[PDB]
Copies of this chain bind each other. A is one copy, B any other.
């Protein structure tokens, strides 16, 4: 039930992120990230790197965004990566068909003057809304006499509109291409090089962190629906016969909300289960998919998402070569939204490219068994993760002045700690320098505060952008011996007093989760 306006205000005011090309009028679905936002984004990515690449020793590659047409023809995208779009005949404006239609069948759905059996009829229409083909959808438009929501004019018949941005590579019009809609295809195109790099053996996993593009018809859902965005995508190639993950028991004990395709057809609600139990009972298929679902859950928790607003939903038969497919979804002000994809495929694009180019993309096994690997496809939409974190960590303090703060875990906070020196009086400098150097020597990110206003108001700002900790340096620090300073916990706003030499060590342990605030108060004298 978060106050999205209040948050969005804070987010824009402090320049986490904002409308790209604002002064030229802005462009919808495009955002610039300000220094604070970049800090956070960079943390989220580093956290991801240690959590996945480093931990599973993944093979990282970095392919181009520019993509010639034939490759994306082969992947189907040229043909099938599109949305149905009607447009206003008298005006000219464009609308996304399915949710414009859905809008109409919620006015009619919600009307006392409408019959019960008719609600039932439209309820079922929405039920299989994503199924209807071109023609069926065009009939649905006539049958419910759909009009433009802005003007109310007659609506053209729904055409398909491909979502890839089109250019030409080179001069003339010889080589047309697109901006990649996903990084998965780059990994596929390098399957051979990667497989070889892995000494020919299997399993192995490749990764990419980069931008893909998606020419959305009319984005108006803030940062959730954007035209350009950064992904972190993993492609874990496994032998179908050796499909048990050795590290699974590391995450087998995790309890988490799962929402099966069978639970959805029944009209049952989601279930919190122990990962092990789920895979043992057949809900989750195998422990490779299982392993990654657990890791994804662990990662998202780490980065600030609330476990009680996090679930894994399985694709149903209709929504698809099909696949066992789970999505991490977070409960938000925009509803439950998908923020990490996780597919399990037998037949997929690797096979297509192979016979397309006449270059074999397979693995040998000593007989010489040609193996077409399965893939698990963890797909991270960094933007949406980041937003989910904003909504989940945003809080308003009880202070009548309506102060806000983000409860960011230290591992993602724009920086872990703020040094507040009461004065710039050059007799403060040695203490600040040393503290800063110490914090650096301990790998604890920090920024020395040079803002005007009271000690209290200065922290307010710190808190507004979610800095985990603070260390005030006052005259007693500089003058009394031993030299001690105040450590302030963001969340509680509580404080402690310890020797300034000791603090770097203390803060490190707090941010690294070796020690609780509770622990600290137990060990060090309380300060107000």
Contact = CB atoms under 8 A, between A and B. Distances in A.
Q: How many copies does the complex hold?
A: 2
A343 to B, nearest CB: 23
Contacts of A15: 193, 197
Interface in A1-56: 15, 18, 20-24, 27-28, 30-35, 37-39, 41
A63 to B, nearest CB: 4
Interface bin, chain A: 35 or more
Interface string A167-200: 1111110010001000000100110111001010
Interface centre among A37, A169, A217, A218 (most CB of B within 10 A): A169
Interface stretch (A66-74, A138-146, A246-254): A66-74
A161 interface: yes
A215 B170 contact: yes
Contact of A186 (B27, B32, B63): B32
A165 interface: yes
The A interface is mostly helix, strand or loop, or mixed, namely: mixed
B71 A21 contact: yes
B18 A66 contact: no
Contact of A66 (B197, B228, B443): B228
Nearest to A69: B24
A374 to B, nearest CB: 21
A66 B353 contact: no
B172 A27 contact: no
Given A166-B167, A169-B215, A30 B197 contact: no
A362 interface: no
A217 B168 CA distance: 12
B23 A359 contact: yes
Nearest to A26: B68
Contacts of A61: 32-35, 38
Given A18-B193, A27-B175, A171-B161, A66 B32 contact: no
B170 A167 contact: no
Contact of A27 (B35, B167, B169, B359): B169
A60 interface: yes
A59 interface: yes
A213 interface: yes
